[PDB]
Design a binder for this molecule. Structure first.
Ligand SMILES: NNC(=O)c1ccc(O)cc1
Length: 480
């Protein structure tokens, strides 16, 4: 057999530029190629053979024999056109995350074979950001039709190994391997087995449905909730550390969590052990910061001072307070963590409405309609492997003003600390700024850092799956 059938969530977009949720990145990974790719000890050559520079400026030398699905030579102008189109068309949040601002300098040179990126101020995260599927290269046929990229394949747009051949919206996305592609990344790791010719990315509505369809052979790979583990042999399971979870409040003037006393009361109600039990059942790990111990600066001083549980004080504060609680269904099986949080808030006398929605709908709400909810457990994908990703959700200009500040938080201290992380002379001054920024954001009740989850793949005999270098959107499927 040459086909793999993979369980996944419904995409909200098949355009790299509009990618916000994991399924969007999963599809973008098959159809488009990024300049660099994740492997152990950092980043590996992909569509760029090598690069030079630092936080203030990077120069990528593009690789030879790189082709689009029509035949266009992938040249410096093709890449710079793609990366410019990304900078202009992607969500403000993911652009400032990639470039430290909305107006990077991007300039090709077909003679030199170079693509030069000059962020409007130094941005360390730029290199790691260009490993992320959403920065995958869109060939000229794709730039001609951006509305087309959203719903599936526009002939010749693909820089990547697969073309989406059949689409059944919200059901199945059938990918076929292109015969004219040997532009694989320069992996240091050796993978056992063969690149699948077909990938059937198959929407599962539910974790129970995921498990059943591995067990009955309707699926070859698929995500399992921790409760389903015992249905499988240890050999059928591949567990990786994945999303890092933390609270995000709507802190805008007139909203209930504009008032810090209300945010503190939520912190006083959220038992982090109980939240971990409901969400991961002990397959995950608690974290006081925006990442795991593998995250750059995540062990540097200072550690945040978390608000202690105080259910009595919280009951006085939240009596009849109206809370629009938005929940992603990845936060525990069918959003069980969001259910726990609603119940802890209701127990404190709050008038809580929970909307538990699929990851695609959740992402559209958080990034498109920020004023439409009060509180969410944010399941972050820390692509860049730094604390910067998380700090950006709470600092700088509001998302409403084309910034990355999802919450609309105004922390003077954290804003200034985000600025000194950028001016930092050394890695150590950078970690001290990042660490102090997280401590400040926790001390002022802008967030509660919760946990790092485990992504558990359950698989059938003859199928492997690998995640290299702590990567999140680069699931390496193989037939064995
Ligand atoms: N935006 N966040 C996501 O798309 C996401 C999806 C699944 C996770 O297990 C974690 C994060």
């Amino acid at each position: 057999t040459s086909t793999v059938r993979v369980g996944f969530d419904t995409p909200q977009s098949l355009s790299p530029f509009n990618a916000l949720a994991l399924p969007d990145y999963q599809t973008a990974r098959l159809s488009y190629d990024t300049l660099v790719r994740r492997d152990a000890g950092g980043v590996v050559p992909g569509l760029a053979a090598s690069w030079t520079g630092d936080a203030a400026q990077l120069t990528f030398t593009i690789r030879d024999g790189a082709t689009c699905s029509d035949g266009t030579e992938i040249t410096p102008t093709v890449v710079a056109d793609s990366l410019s189109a990304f900078a202009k068309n992607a969500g403000p949040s993911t652009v400032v995350d990639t470039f430290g601002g909305l107006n990077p300098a991007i300039t090709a040179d077909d003679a030199a074979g170079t693509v030069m990126i000059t962020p409007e101020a130094p941005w360390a995260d730029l290199l790691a950001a260009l490993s992320v599927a959403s920065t995958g290269i869109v060939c000229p046929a794709g730039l001609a039709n951006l509305d087309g990229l959203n719903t599936g394949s526009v002939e010749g747009a693909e820089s990547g190994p697969y073309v989406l051949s059949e689409v059944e919206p919200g059901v199945r996305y059938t990918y076929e391997l292109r015969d004219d592609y040997d532009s694989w990344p320069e992996w240091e790791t050796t993978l056992e087995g063969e690149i699948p010719k077909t990938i059937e990315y198959t929407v599962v509505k539910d974790p129970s449905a995921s498990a059943n369809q591995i067990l009955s052979g309707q699926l070859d790979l698929g995500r399992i909730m921790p409760d389903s583990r015992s249905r499988f042999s240890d050999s059928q399971l591949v567990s990786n550390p994945f999303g890092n979870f933390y609270l995000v409040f709507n802190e805008r003037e007139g909203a209930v969590f504009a008032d810090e006393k209300n945010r503190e009361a939520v912190a006083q109600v959220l038992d982090r052990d109980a939240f971990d039990q409901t969400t991961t059942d002990g397959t995950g790990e608690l974290t006081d910061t925006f990442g795991s111990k593998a995250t750059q600066c995540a062990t540097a001083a200072p550690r945040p001072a978390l608000t202690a549980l105080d259910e009595s004080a919280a009951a006085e504060t939240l009596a009849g307070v109206k809370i629009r609680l938005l929940g992603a269904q990845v936060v525990g099986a069918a959003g069980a963590g969001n259910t726990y949080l609603e119940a802890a808030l209701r127990e404190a006398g709050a008038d809580v409405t929970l909307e538990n929605v699929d990851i695609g709908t959740w992402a559209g709400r958080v990034f498109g309609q920020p004023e439409s909810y009060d509180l969410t457990v944010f399941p972050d994908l820390n692509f860049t492997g730094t604390l910067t990703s998380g700090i950006s959700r709470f600092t700088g200009p509001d998302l409403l003003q084309n910034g990355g500040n999802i919450s609309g938080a105004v922390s003077e201290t954290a804003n200034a600390l985000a600025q000194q992380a950028r001016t930092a002379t050394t890695p150590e001054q950078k970690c001290a700024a990042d660490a102090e920024a997280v401590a400040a954001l926790v001390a002022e009740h802008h967030t509660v850092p919760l946990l790092v989850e485990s992504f558990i793949y359950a698989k059938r005999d003859g199928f492997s799956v690998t995640m290299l270098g702590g990567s999140l959107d680069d699931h390496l499927f193989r037939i064995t």
